[PDB]
Design a binder for this molecule. Structure first.
Ligand SMILES: CCNc1cc(C(=O)N[C@@H](Cc2ccccc2)[C@H](O)CN[C@@H](C)C(=O)NC2CCCCC2)cc(N(c2ccccc2)S(C)(=O)=O)c1
Length: 371
């Protein structure tokens, strides 16, 4: 009943059906591990099919406080309150939770995305206005018996499993990396390889100034230095074809005659994550089918066209949806760790498969955390 409860794509977000208020108002809500506010469109907007009508909910309580939330893409402002919330295809519970009723926004809502709100699944430390606004999942755990864990299989569609791990959603072993600090889902990258060749940087550079696991961001985003080095290595591996600079910056598409995308000219990318034991790690391996994001457009449909879904960041590494796709990712809040396994909807062709493998050991005793 919880399997296949997500819909959406990397480019516009994955969303789960929820209800808010009494009687229940159905809304589609984007699942975002990169923020901590639960918010819903609560006034008309050109891109909203529907919105939260507070006047129709007898259980709504106004908190008499405004809130402003800026993301890397988009921003909104609204009014804080609480109300009853359910998840039809999740655990069969009703919880009273904080809700931001979005009354104005800028470049937040996306035309044709099919979602009307956002579920920030990260910790109170990054909630707005401040950490006294209890996030939804904290409320869910406090008010119900639900174990303090959820998992995401992003495949479009996929699954969010609340309170547990569904073995039918992965194969092989789950490998865990520590949550370094409970704010974002902050992790530590210890090594990066492109087609098995080490980028050969001080590992702190990979985590400058943090590294996060963020289902709400489309791309793998990398600190400038790491991004520049990664692109150089990917260009070199793929040098049998030459692409415009705009492609490498994510500003223009690359297109091939339908069915002829040359996957084998593009390298695999391995991100090594800190293990749960000193100087041990494991790797997750990303295929080009993950980091070249298809852009569906009937107009270009004589071809398959893609955007390069690795991009630069000035706020640290963001392991976005294109990285999470094809892995089963367990947000094990109870044990302050994040587990990765190969997903039942993994990417592969006949030559290569995405992987989660270990253990690996390092001689260098440097702490890779930036601080
Ligand atoms: C899914 C829509 N595509 C997209 C979204 C975001 C993004 O900012 N996602 C936020 C949620 C969201 C979802 C849908 C529409 C708009 C926004 C995430 O919460 C961001 N998480 C972190 C990084 C964050 O900013 N947390 C905030 C939370 C509030 C408190 C303060 C911290 C970034 C980029 N990408 C992008 C686009 C433009 C510029 C930079 C990145 S991309 C193209 O690189 O994937 C692309």
């Amino acid at each position: 009943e919880m399997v296949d409860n997500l819909r959406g794509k990397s480019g516009q977000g994955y969303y789960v059906e929820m209800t808010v208020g009494s009687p229940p108002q159905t809304l589609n809500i984007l699942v975002d591990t990169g923020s901590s506010n639960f918010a819903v469109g609560a006034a008309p907007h050109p891109f909203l099919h529907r919105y939260y009508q507070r006047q129709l909910s007898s259980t709504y309580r106004d908190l008499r406080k405004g809130v402003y939330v800026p993301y890397t893409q988009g921003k909104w402002e609204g009014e804080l309150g609480t109300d009853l919330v359910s998840i039809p295809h999740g655990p069969q519970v009703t919880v009273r939770a904080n809700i931001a009723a979005i009354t104005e926004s800028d470049k937040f809502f996306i035309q044709g995305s099919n979602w009307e709100g956002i579920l920030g699944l990260a910790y109170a430390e990054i909630a707005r206005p401040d950490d006294s606004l209890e996030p939804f999942f904290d409320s869910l755990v406090k008010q119900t018996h639900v174990p303090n864990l959820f998992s995401l299989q992003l495949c479009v569609g996929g699954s969010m499993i609340i309170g547990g791990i569904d073995h039918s959603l992965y194969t092989g072993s789950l490998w865990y990396t520590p949550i370094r600090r409970e704010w974002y889902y902050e992790v530590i990258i210890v090594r990066v390889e492109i087609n098995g060749q080490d980028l050969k940087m001080d590992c702190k550079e990979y985590n400058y100034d943090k590294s996060i696991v963020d289902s709400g961001t489309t791309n793998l985003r990398l600190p400038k230095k790491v991004f520049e080095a990664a692109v150089k290595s990917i260009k070199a591996a793929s040098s049998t074809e030459k692409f415009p600079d705009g492609f490498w910056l994510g500003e223009q598409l690359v297109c091939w005659q339908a069915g002829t995308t040359p996957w084998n000219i593009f390298p695999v990318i391995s991100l090594y994550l800190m293990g749960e034991v000193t100087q041990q790690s494991f790797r997750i391996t990303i295929l080009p089918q993950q980091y070249l994001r298809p852009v569906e457009d009937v107009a270009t449909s004589q071809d398959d066209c893609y955007k390069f879904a690795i991009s630069q960041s000035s706020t640290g590494t963001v392991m976005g949806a294109v990285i999470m796709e094809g892995f089963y990712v367990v947000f094990d809040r109870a044990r302050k760790r994040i587990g990765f396994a190969v997903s039942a909807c993994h990417v592969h062709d006949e030559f290569r498969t995405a992987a989660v493998e270990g253990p690996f050991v390092t001689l260098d005793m440097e702490d890779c955390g930036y601080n």
